[PDB]
Every structure is written in C-alpha cells, then in structure tokens.
Amino acid sequence: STGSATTTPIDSLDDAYITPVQIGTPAQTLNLDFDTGSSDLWVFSSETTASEVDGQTIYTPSKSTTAKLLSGATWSISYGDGSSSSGDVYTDTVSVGGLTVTGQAVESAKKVSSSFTEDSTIDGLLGLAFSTLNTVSPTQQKTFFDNAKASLDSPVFTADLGYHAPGTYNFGFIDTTAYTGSITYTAVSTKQGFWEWTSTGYAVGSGTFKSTSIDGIADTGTTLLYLPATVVSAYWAQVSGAKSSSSVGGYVFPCSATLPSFTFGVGSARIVIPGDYIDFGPISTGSSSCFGGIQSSAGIGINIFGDVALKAAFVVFNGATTPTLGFASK
Numbered sequence: 408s409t410g411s412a413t414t415t416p417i418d419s420l421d422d423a424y425i426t427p428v429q430i431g432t433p434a435q436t437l438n439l440d441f442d443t444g445s446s447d448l449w450v451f452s453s454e455t456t457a458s459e460v461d462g463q464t465i466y467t468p469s470k471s472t473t474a475k476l477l478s479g480a481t482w483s484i485s486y487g488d489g490s491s492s493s494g495d496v497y498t499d500t501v502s503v504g505g506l507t508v509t510g511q512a513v514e515s516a517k518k519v520s521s522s523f524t525e526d527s528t529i530d531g532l533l534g535l536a537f538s539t540l541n542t543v544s545p546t547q548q549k550t551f552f553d554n555a556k557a558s559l560d561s562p563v564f565t566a567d568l569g570y571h572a573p574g575t576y577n578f579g580f581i582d583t584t585a586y587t588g589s590i591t592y593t594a595v596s597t598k599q600g601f602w603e604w605t606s607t608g609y610a611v612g613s614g615t616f617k618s619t620s621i622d623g624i625a626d627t628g629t630t631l632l633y634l635p636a637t638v639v640s641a642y643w644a645q646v647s648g649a650k651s652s653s654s655v656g657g658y659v660f661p662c663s664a665t666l667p668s669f670t671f672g673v674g675s676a677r678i679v680i681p682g683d684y685i686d687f688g689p690i691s692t693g694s695s696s697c698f699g700g701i702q703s704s705a706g707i708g709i710n711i712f713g714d715v716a717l718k719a720a721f722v723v724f725n726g727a728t729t730p731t732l733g734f735a736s737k
C-alpha cells in the first residue's frame with residue numbers, strides 16, 4: 408500500500424503545516440501537525456476541557472463505530488516549546504492520503520496548554536519519530552508509520568514541505584518526479600528516539616563551505632533551524648544590523664535587509680536554503696525588526712533541522728531495519 412496527502416502551511420510565515428487525517432467510522436477529518444520530532448498521535452476531542460477548545464475540530468469517539476477505549480491507558484507530553492497536552496486513549500481506524508491503519512492509538516486530549524488552544528488551525532499532532540518516545544502508559548503505543556510499515560510497498564515516508572505553499576507527505580513510495588538530481592542518504596541514530604543525523608558542514612551565502620560535523624534531528628514539528636552558536640553568529644554577521652536580542656528571544660534583523668542563503672551538507676551533497684526562507688517577519692505587528700529563521704541551539708541541548716531547513720529539500724525518512732535519512736534538492 409501507499410498514501411499521499413497534501414500538507415498546507417497554517418499561516419503566511421509557514422509556522423507549521425497541517426495535513427488532513429481521517430479518524431473513525433464514519434470518518435472524522437481533523438487537520439493534524441505531522442511531527443517527525445515526536446511519537447504521539449493526539450487530538451482535540453469531545454473530552455477536551457471546554458474552555459481549552461477555541462475553533463479546533465474535535466474527534467468524538469462516541470460517534471465512531473470502530474472506536475474502542477484502551478482501558479487504563481493515559482498519556483502526557485510536553486514539547487520543546489514548553490507546550491503540553493494529556494488525556495486518555497482510544498484505538499480506531501486512521502487514514503492518511505488513502506493509507507489506512509486499523510487499531511491505531513488515538514490519544515484523546517483532556518487538557519491542552521494555552522498555545523494549543525490559541526491556535527485554531529491545528530486539531531492535534533501525528534508523531535513520526537520512533538515509537539520508543541511514545542508517552543502512553545502503562546503500555547506504550549506505536550506510531551501511525553510503525554503500524555503501517557509492514558503493509559507499505561517500501562518502509563519509508565517522505566516530507567516535501569513548501570515555502571509559502573502546499574507540499575506533500577507520501578507513505579510507502581518515493582516520488583521520483585518530486586526532486587532534482589539524486590537523493591543522498593546519511594546515517595541515523597535512533598538512540599534518543601529521533602531522526603538524528605550528522606550534517607557535514609555549512610556555508611553562508613556565496614561563502615566557502617566549512618567542513619564540520621553537526622549532529623541534529625530532522626524535525627518537521629519545529630519551525631526554525633537551530634544550530635550551534637558559532638554557526639549562527641557566522642550567518643547573522645553577514646546581515647547589516649542583525650543582533651541577538653535577549654528581550655525578543657533570538658536573532659533579529661532589519662526588515663529592510665536582503666538575507667543571504669544558508670547551505671548545509673549531507674555527505675558530499677549540499678542543500679541550499681534561500682535567504683527568503685530565513686525571514687520570519689516583524690517581531691510584532693508593524694515593527695521594522697524582523698525575526699530570524701536561523702537561531703542558536705545553545706539553550707536546547709540539541710541541534711534541530713526544522714521546517715526552515717527541511718522545506719528546502721525532498722526528505723526521505725527510511726524506516727528500514729537500519730533507518731537512514733535521504734535529502735535531495737528540488
């Protein structure tokens with residue numbers, strides 16, 4: 408089997424992407440944030456505290472003839488941005504882009520933190536990291552990908568995120584029309600439960616490539632590119648007036664600037680992030696100070712190849728017995 412679903416930016420800045428997902432019988436379609444940096448499929452639901460729901464579409468398990476309470480199971484998760492959610496668990500039928508999994512754990516939120524409530528466009532998350540990170544207790548549950556894998560034509564999914572435009576998540580096949588040149592594959596460590604890999608270095612604008620190992624994670628659920636302070640300083644030093652602002656919470660730059668590109672290495676290959684991808688707009692409405700899309704990972708403990716980086720590439724998440732990651736230009 409295979410599946411193919413379009414993923415759409417939630418706003419003009421590409422802060423996140425939503426992908427429609429069918430849950431239950433008859434189908435209830437919710438727009439989920441596909442997150443390669445976590446491993447829980449959770450949804451706003453009929454069980455979510457009413458004051459914490461503001462415009463989201465909810466899953467109502469009592470209206471699904473295939474929903475079954477997973478007795479005794481609870482979940483609770485907190486993300487890198489400080490947000491969180493928790494609740495209980497059903498199994499139900501879940502389909503993405505024509506690919507169907509029966510008996511998928513659908514984690515029903517009883518509580519969500521304010522940032523979830525405040526974002527009406529995201530109805531929940533669909534985790535695509537390794538199932539070892541799944542938070543369901545006392546019996547850990549498998550991701551949608553993990554459940555689907557054996558049925559897939561090839562044990563892979565791909566992320567093709569758009570810049571200010573829709574893109575695609577495919578399951579079970581590599582669309583050879585969706586990228587240019589060849590796909591360069593690189594080793595993955597699953598030790599921390601992430602799609603963790605080592606970039607071979609970077610360049611700023613038309614500058615020379617610096618060969619240096621940068622360990623980080625491919626994380627579709629993180630907006631920005633978070634890299635070591637040395638690398639980030641080298642980037643922003645090429646932008647007149649750019650500075651790190653502790654009050655704002657990162658590098659800012661004059662909105663009048665034209666940003667340089669940023670290149671990262673994948674083996675001997677190179678992925679170029681155009682300068683415009685690194686512009687996250689005014690820090691507050693009407694400001695002439697703009698927020699940068701490349702930020703330091705120093706306060707995080709891990710480097711994160713988030714959407715800013717990933718949307719410059721066609722990315723293969725290879726879930727074969729020894730997982731790997733592939734990157735192509737597009």
Ligand SMILES: CN(C)c1cccc(C(=O)NN)c1
Nearest residue numbers: 442444445485486487628629
């Ligand atoms: C340390 N934490 C929780 C962490 C680290 C790195 C990534 C994430 C995540 O949720 N990504 N979508 C979370």
